[PDB]
Ligand SMILES: O=P(O)(O)OC[C@H]1O[C@H](O)[C@H](O)[C@H](O)[C@@H]1O
């Protein structure tokens with residue numbers, strides 16, 4: 001049972017609703033950060049930042065951000081200090097986001113997948129463990145340090 | 157002809173050399189930020205931060221970050237202030253990254269695509285114009301302001 005913060009704009013809104021239901025039915029705890037209704041002109045960054053901020057503030061939780069293409073949503077989420085947001089476009093990439101990047105969040109482009117495909121991605125994301133492998137941790141650490149100082153690490 | 161800053165770790169290294177060749181042959185200006193050799197144990201963040209930093213520092217340029225899965229690489233690039241790095245997993249997502257997100261960078265997962273698929277992704281990214289549509293600019297602006305102030309925009 002994972003806690004999962006969900007954020008979506010209008011383009012991800014109906015998929016977000018289906019994912020909430022799916023997560024409830026599969027033993028997890030979805031928390032809706034908005035949008036709480038369909039507003040055709042609404043702007044994804046607020047909801048992505050909301051979901052990412054909550055996820056980083058609640059260590060051990062996960063987050064999913066949803067819009068049309070997934071890319072703006074993950075870009076926005078990655079601007080939150082400490083957040084690592086992968087773009088999940090397949091079951092394999094959702095799994096690797098957890099296993100290699102210890103990604104707390106994924107973005108999913110609601111316009112790029114059928115509901116069934118999207119729910120399979122969600123499943124992979126919420127069930128795949130972080131490997132804790134030394135090299136993966138080292139790379140996350142290097143990034144975390146860069147976030148702290150904004151000093152670009154040297155290239156060999 | 158675009159200027160394109162390229163970064164890669166060992167997993168994206170061979171694909172990078174291939175993309176450099178392709179960009180030269182198609183009238184563009186690639187600039188290699190490393191890795192300059194195959195090193196099986198090397199760490200993607202420095203190469204991605206390097207490419208993203210150079211790209212943001214040179215308005216009008218684009219950048220491409222390359223690794224195994226693409227996701228760690230775009231996460232790293234997105235930590236650079238002002239950088240918008242999309243995960244390009246298809247010709248469509250490469251195109252929309254430019255059209256909708258005015259993304260200066262894409263990440264590509266070398267282990268996820270054939271060379272021919274990757275090069276078609278590259279072509280879409282370096283030839284698709286930014287739309288400049290009001291709503292897309294507004295969202296990019298909202299994100300830039302969050303980046304500047306870390307004041308999370310309010311959610312309805
Ligand atoms: O405003 P519309 O619905 O056309 O587009 C909204 C979408 O724009 C871009 O594609 C963003 O990456 C994001 O996915 C957002 O959901």
Ligand SMILES: O=P(O)(O)OC[C@H]1O[C@H](O)[C@H](O)[C@H](O)[C@@H]1O
Nearest residue numbers: 100167223224225226227228229
């Ligand atoms: O160290 P190895 O080669 O197993 O993996 C390296 C890869 O790790 C992760 O997948 C990152 O997202 C990135 O794609 C990197 O290139």
